[PDB]
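Ticket #889: bound-state structure for magnesium ion.
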Amino acid sequence: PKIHYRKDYKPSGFIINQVTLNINIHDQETIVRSVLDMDISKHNVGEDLVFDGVGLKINEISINNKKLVEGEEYTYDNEFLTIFSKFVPKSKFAFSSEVIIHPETNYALTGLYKSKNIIVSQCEATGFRRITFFIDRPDMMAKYDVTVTADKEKYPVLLSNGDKVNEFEIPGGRHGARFNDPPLKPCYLFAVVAGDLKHLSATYITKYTKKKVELYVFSEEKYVSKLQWALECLKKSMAFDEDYFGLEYDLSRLNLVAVSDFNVGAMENKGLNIFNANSLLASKKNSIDFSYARILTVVGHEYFHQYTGNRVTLRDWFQLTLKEGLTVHRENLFSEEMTKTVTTRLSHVDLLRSVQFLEDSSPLSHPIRPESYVSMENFYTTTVYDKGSEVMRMYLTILGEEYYKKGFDIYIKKNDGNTATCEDFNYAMEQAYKMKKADNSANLNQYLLWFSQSGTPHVSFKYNYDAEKKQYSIHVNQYTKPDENQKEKKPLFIPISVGLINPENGKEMISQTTLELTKESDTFVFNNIAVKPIPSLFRGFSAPVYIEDQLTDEERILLLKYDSDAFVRYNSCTNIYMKQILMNYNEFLKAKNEKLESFQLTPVNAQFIDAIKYLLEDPHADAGFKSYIVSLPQDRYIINFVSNLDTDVLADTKEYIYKQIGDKLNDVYYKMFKSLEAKADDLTYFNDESHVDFDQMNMRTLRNTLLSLLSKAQYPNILNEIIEHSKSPYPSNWLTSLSVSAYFDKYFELYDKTYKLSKDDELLLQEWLKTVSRSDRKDIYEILKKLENEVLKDSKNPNDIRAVYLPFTNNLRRFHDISGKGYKLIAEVITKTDKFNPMVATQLCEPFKLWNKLDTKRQELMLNEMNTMLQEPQISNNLKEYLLRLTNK
Ligand SMILES: N[C@@H](c1ccc(-n2cccn2)cc1)P(=O)(O)O
Ligand SMILES: [Mg+2]
Ligand SMILES: [Mg+2]
Ligand SMILES: [Zn+2]
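RESOLUTION: The complex was predicted; output attached.
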């Protein structure tokens, strides 16, 4: 396998000026004719002409309308087409070809493929070379003129980029459309779609130039009534970019299309965005509440790529974080503004500190700009997207809104063009930084280490208060553990948003202040501090770091009650739980290792329980926040703090802490679950397709969280509540009724009732599968085998496969069964999936990422399964490279 290095970037010695495509789709094959108008670039050194082209069946190739001869003038090995230089012209010339491809049997979902009755393309990153020959790298910009033909009855709707310029009838029941897209684009932004598509549409009038933009959202006919929310999300997304960034859509039309079979969430092809149906379609009757935030963020994300990816483009794939990290940052600012709930930011932090921190301390650790790759298929990671987004968000923290907006406008003005690199972005923020400091010596040079250095920095704190002097000092230290990418880790530029809270009255003692930590350690001193403060550190989670606050639980409890920053309040509560978790885990571990006949456990801090009750009982406090404070930190967050983690000991620890708190608060939880009903489940706008109330949904989250706590505890007669909840019209409630009934004899009665409610909507059936998979059932292995035989069968839909298996892999007791049977089962699924879809096979490897963090026995069980998968003779390149890197071999 060839390793591509970032240091090795060089421009092509060719240019492709114009692509003219004819894509003729037939029952058993698709014929693709392509003419490329080419030139020799100024970098050319007389080399062979080499096209990417994977799995293509050549009918013929030509230069300037003369057929080329296989063997004597060119070789093709199913990956590269090599035309020997003696036969390549030295001025403007035309290369043509006709190849045959087979979208019907393309089950890897990359290139051109069939999803149910829709034909659709997926070109990022290197899928265009599965459609026709090309120099398939993002710096090859060309013009595109595309014609598609197909059977009119099967494929009445034909779409590709640009203007539809001609439509025409073809003998034998066929038809055609031609689309011309004159502005230059990279080939990974080409798209085509054909199908019996239905739609909703609206007209949006831009803010400044008042251009009419037509918006179309498409699906298969069955689900067209689930498109309205997506259309509202698109309007909101355009308004946002207009209001916050001053940016208007440049084209006359934007199409959104939902497909059933898709590897990720969606894709930003220019004016033709294609989506996983689960991230475009929703209704109140047939979707859980999560689908509403999901569609808003995914529609938003692909819209924002129209500037950050599509008009300012990447030179090479190493700069991927520049388009993805920045688009995620734009997406998160939009979500925050649209939902107006504090749990939106908290949920982004929850994701980074569980999943991304785990990745960053694993053998897979990489900086947000890597120095090498082998498979572009495995490069689209939480580190590139989500830590990339936190790095892009730190510029805004450092500069503030006014100067951030100035530096961004600087980057967009200069590079609307025009490929760019991460240094160009940094340069633009620097110019805003010079202007902010009003000092032109000031620079962001050290900031660049955020792109190049891998691993999570640890940031720790000591304090001093001199009561006579009224002088308060915060001593800060940063450290990043050496790893495979850097032996010596340099200090980063770490912005620490802070407040100082008066412990007597809960008030702020200082204005907004962001500490700029630029050295291994520094001491920040504040004068005129009248009383000893509690420091509120990393407000908003202002850098992607392990925060070691060194506060007492009494201080943490005070922040949790009285601080103004949601993240700090949640983090204080998190740190109280972690102190408790590590304590009880070591007490359980000692008792198991020493085989003790009796031992003691440290109870949960009583004043922390009192503070939870105080917050729950506060009718003005936020319900979404309340659901965060009654839940323990995620297992994948906990694992970052324990060596050789025994998952059974952690399951017993979590069980003890939940029971400790429930034994004090279950009456309070019951009362709230009942008093929340009226507002949480209010049906007033149930038939209003466009009315989405994020606060109401967070009330439902809370009720569903409290119901789960009450069921685990077997609170008296709670089954009555579960059975009533199953009759709710909201799928969030009735699916919740299924999972909490796991602890009762009614489980299979609700399994059947909710299957029946779910079975006729393809997405809602996928949510039912996830609910079953995640159910806390002792017979969960037999239940999985039942879903396999009855519901999943041999589905190659990645949504179906992921729904049956991924939630189960989070079942701490059972997936991690000491016999290794769970690791066995997931490995069998990965290998089976790898036969047809290597990308999804790699996604199904996710539970294995923490393998070297677990206890001795479990490390060995997981390594065994990874080595077994690695030894499969038919392993894909993608799965092989991933598992070799994961197992350090
Ligand atoms: N850029 C989009 C996308 C689509 C597909 C893939 N993909 C990566 C490997 C194979 N397909 C990557 C990104 P997005 O960030 O999902 O908007
Ligand atoms: Mg083929
Ligand atoms: Mg299906
Ligand atoms: Zn993206």
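RESOLUTION NOTES: The first strand starts at residue 4 and ends at 5.
TICKET STATUS: resolved
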